[PDB]
């Protein structure tokens, strides 16, 4: 089964790429697995596969850390992401994002129901498992629980059956048969939860599948539109209908090759302690005391020799940055284009802790609009910051065609030299804010509102007659024939490989 | 003569450090020398010494490019700067800046007049030189002239004789015996020029010395206070009185070992075309048509086999960033401390194109002030943006004690996650602005006023009870004994030198 369609095959692919370290000696899920993984993420090292996890019993479980993190080399920097999607390991960010957007104007390919799959190789009922007895990791030393759920997909369906959402949202063990987790607006798990709470008749049927098809975990991390069933979007993107099996205790469907499946309910009435957690922006606030949603687990099914993927998230660079940030940027690019805004590219610079998105403007089209910075800033901000795809993003940086938004150095150069603080910016105080950013939830103002800005790093003539500068760099301030001579004589003169 | 006190010795020191490439084949001053130098600066390669410059006659001149640029290795990244100052090549930025500030509370050591020096080995009078006939570089293809002056020091003295200023300001060849250059407020060359213009009796006696003592070119690049003679500050910093010789045609004094000396006058009445020039922020605006100050050259003296240093400035990283940015930051640190502000460190992040300064706060002292963000931001901005040392800086970022301001990644992390746009900032529109920044001089607003901001990246409890987070990183989210175990077993498990 191909790597992008089967997590077990994906692990093999990383091994074959020389992008995996198999640790076969005992490793403690209390901090040690996550510490190794954190070190991997901070240094762009190989993904760790913990085959011998202290507390693993009867097949539950091994851990794969850093499933979507960066490789050291520039040439295959995003190779782990490419392996989620059947792309060459040398794929660029543009190509990865374009793959993730490709299904947006294709007919969905709905999933195929099959009678069984590897996820049914083992089962534990309501009398046979205890979630406190599994080797669930403590990921950061001040975390408020053991975060079993950092890289599985929650499966919930609208009461009317018409929309089945797949998404990543964190969750930790509360007791032997419950989790608590984040379920917050405007996220689709929250939107669907609210539909069940308004109906008021029952708890939400739920499943959480770990080690799902890599192409599915990518879509689970992306803000595809309201009402769109991720399974059919992944089908269209991949050209293949995903094979799903029914849950044993409810009528939801899970990927046939899921490593581990939890089946149960997301309560419409109960809460319990959740967090704190070392989060995507790089912080934990020890002792924060929040209430979260509460999930009841009724059944576990799993593959022989099941593998749990884990994101040891925090400071750069991990799945929260590579997947949640980039995929939000991708959706923002499309949103802007669908609102007739002349945006070619979008990326959330890692340097911004994926709190900014840089928007590359087609300045030929901008000139034909005969508009101004103030007007255009407002239009862009209104589109993005009033939409769910803009939720996590607090600063939009508008740049002209010379800037490669996938290159953070160039975004920072343009921002720092082309956007006059105050005058070239528009603040947005009456939009939803992202409380996880420290300056929001732990800051001076409302946790849930405002704190957003459009920063215009377009220069004035980019609105009118065209770019009126050349860069003072090697590329732009010397003619072609001189540049090539300098390069050709570089090592001869006594100065100092692409793959590496 | 030691490297920090003699430019010729400094060149030898770079050779001995394996930090020099001697090019002995012909190189064109029309773009080629500068293109090589630009490539060096963009890649942190060895400094180029052009020993065979097309158009060099009768000893004028060789070129040293990239005299104050970065080395590739982390361990001796700032080694070329350290060689300006008798510091070990492994010196940190903090140590370099502390050396440059050390003379601020020492008695000056005035210079020593000697009867002759190497700068008198050759001379050309008013009938023997033509500045258009020298191998003056064209540094960027759209420059409005050949910029002879990118790394020499202008010498001007107050009418009353009490203050002799040394500073870098650019200048280009206007004709056989004149230069034009930037002379702009609030710079000390401008302040002194204004004193002569108010007296109204004569043009300003002037000299321009190239290849001066490295410790002197450092001070020439730093905004030491009004009225302070750089020569005596350099004397105090180095512990040695600098040896100066009198000019032949005026009563100014130049360093005895200067490579090349121009003697003449800076007009109090005349101007001529100046620029455009590929500038520190990374841009040139071809055809800009500005008038600049006009200098008349009456005499040239020079060393046998004279070497002209050259800065091929523009995009990262060159002397404008390493010296002008960092040295402004240093002065800002001191200014803040002298205004009883609890600042420990200051640095202009290269990522900001040295338009930001990050200010590290002693948050114990901040807490004892019992103040608020709004108040403290205003106080810091008022001190810095109303002073000459703040001229070139448009954004101040306040950070707490956990941030190393010499590490741009960490400044960017703190800015992006701890400063809420708008609410945690104060804009300053009624302060002098730096017109060279594109968003100022080529932007939407007044070229010379405003566009400044204090961005407070202190978190709320940093004002009150203390930091209330831990970072979600390897360093902070795992105990010491676990971290050391992970490091000790890193290569054993199968994961991947300080000098490299
Ligand atoms: C890739 C990735 C994404 C997310 C998360 C993580 C990873 C690895 C955690 C490590 C578990 C950390 C956690 O903070 N986390 C997370 C989360 N969204 C939430 O509502 N709640 C969460 O706790 N997203 C983001 C969401 O996955 C996306 O916003 C997605 O768009 C949602 O899907 P949908 O609502 O659009 O269907
Ligand atoms: C290191 C360095 C500094 C400067 C410059 C360069 C280098 C290499 C050029 C490559 C020549 C580019 C040019 O834009 N340039 C420059 C300049 N200051 C100006 O007024 N005008 C200039 O044209 N400074 C900055 C000044 O040297 C400092 O601001 C110093 O503080 C001034 O001395 P003072 O007025 O404080 O005595
Ligand atoms: O736990 C975290 O890092 C985190 C929570 C969250 C909520 C929404 C979007 C992205 C998210 N990331
Ligand atoms: O409701 C609030 O006051 C609040 C929510 C929240 C979520 C994450 C971090 C900090 C937060 N503060
Ligand atoms: O030419 C340039 O890069 C430049 C001009 C200038 C004026 C003042 C301060 C720094 C400066 N740099
Ligand atoms: O006076 C002005 O309009 C102006 C001055 C200046 C200096 C450098 C760059 C652009 C500029 N514009
Ligand atoms: K999703
Ligand atoms: K702008
Ligand atoms: K100076
Ligand atoms: K703040
Ligand atoms: Mn969805
Ligand atoms: Mn001065």
Automatic annotation (TrEMBL), chains A, B:
Protein name: Ferulic acid decarboxylase 1
SUPFAM superfamilies per record: FMN-binding split barrel (SSF50475), UbiD C-terminal domain-like (SSF143968)
An annotated GO BP: ferulate metabolic process
Gene that this sequence comes from: FDC1
Keywords: Cytoplasm, Decarboxylase, Flavoprotein, FMN, Lyase, Manganese, Metal-binding
Binding site for Mn(2+): 165, 188, 230
Segments forming domain 3-octaprenyl-4-hydroxybenzoate carboxy-lyase-like N-terminal: 11-100
Residues at the catalytic site: 279
Naturally occurring in which organism (per UniProt): Aspergillus niger
Cofactor binding notes: Binds 1 prenylated FMN per subunit.
Entry function: Catalyzes the reversible decarboxylation of aromatic carboxylic acids like ferulic acid, p-coumaric acid or cinnamic acid, producing the corresponding vinyl derivatives 4-vinylphenol, 4-vinylguaiacol, and styrene, respectively, which play the role of aroma metabolites.
3-octaprenyl-4-hydroxybenzoate carboxy-lyase-like C-terminal domain mapped to chain residues: 321-457
């Amino acid at each position: 089964q191909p790597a992008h369609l089967c997590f077990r095959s994906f692990v093999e692919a990383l091994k074959v790429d020389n992008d995996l370290v198999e640790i076969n000696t005992p490793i403690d899920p209390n901090l040690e697995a996550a510490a190794i993984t954190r070190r991997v993420c901070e240094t762009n090292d190989k993904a760790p596969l913990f085959n011998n996890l202290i507390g693993m019993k009867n097949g539950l479980f091994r851990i794969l850390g850093a499933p979507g993190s960066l490789r050291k080399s520039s040439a295959d920097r995003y190779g782990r992401l490419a392996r989620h999607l059947a792309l060459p390991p040398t794929a660029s960010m543009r190509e990865i994002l374009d793959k993730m957007l490709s299904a947006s104007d294709m007919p969905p390919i709905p999933p195929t129901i099959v009678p069984t799959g590897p996820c049914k190789e083992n089962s534990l009922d309501d009398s046979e498992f205890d979630l406190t007895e599994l080797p669930v990791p403590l990921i950061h030393k001040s975390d408020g629980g053991k975060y079993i759920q950092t890289y599985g997909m929650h499966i919930v369906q609208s009461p009317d059956g018409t929309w089945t959402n797949w998404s990543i949202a964190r969750a930790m063990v509360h007791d032997k048969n419950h989790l608590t987790g984040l379920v917050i607006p405007p996220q689709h798990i929250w939107q669907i939860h609210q539909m069940w709470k308004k109906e008021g008749r029952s708890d939400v049927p739920w499943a959480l599948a770990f080690g799902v098809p890599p192409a599915a975990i990518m879509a689970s991390s992306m803000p595809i539109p309201d009402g769109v069933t991720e399974a059919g979007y992944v089908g269209a993107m991949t050209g293949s209908s995903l094979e799903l099996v029914k849950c044993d205790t409810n009528d939801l469907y899970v990927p046939a090759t899921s490593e581990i499946v939890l089946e149960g309910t997301l309560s419409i009435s109960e809460t319990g302690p959740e967090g704190p957690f070392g989060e995507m922006h790089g912080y934990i606030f020890p002792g924060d005391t929040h209430l979260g949603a509460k999930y009841k687990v009724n059944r576990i099914t799993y593959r022989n020799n099941a593998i749990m993927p884990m994101s040891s998230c925090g400071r750069l660079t991990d799945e929260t940055h590579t997947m949640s940030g980039s995929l939000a940027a991708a959706e923002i690019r499309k949103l802007c284009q669908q609102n007739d805004l002349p945006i070619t590219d979008a990326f959330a610079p890692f340097e911004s802790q994926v709190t900014w998105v840089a928007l590359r403007v087609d300045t030929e089209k901008l000139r034909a609009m005969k508009t101004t910075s103030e007007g255009f800033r407002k239009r862009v901000g209104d589109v993005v910051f009033n939409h769910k795809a803009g939720y996590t993003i607090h600063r939009l940086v508008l740049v002209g065609d010379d800037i490669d938004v996938y290159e953070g150095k160039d975004v920072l150069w343009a921002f720092s030299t082309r956007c006059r603080p105050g005058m070239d910016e528009t603040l947005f105080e009456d939009v939803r804010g992202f409380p996880l950013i420290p300056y929001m939830g732990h800051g001076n103002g409302p946790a849930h509102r405002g704190g957003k800005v459009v920063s215009d790093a377009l220069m004035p003539t980019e609105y009118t007659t065209g770019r009126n500068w050349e860069a003072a760099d090697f590329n732009q301030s010397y003619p072609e024939d001189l540049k090539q001579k300098v390069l050709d004589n570089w090592t001869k003169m006594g100065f100092s490989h692409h793959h590496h």
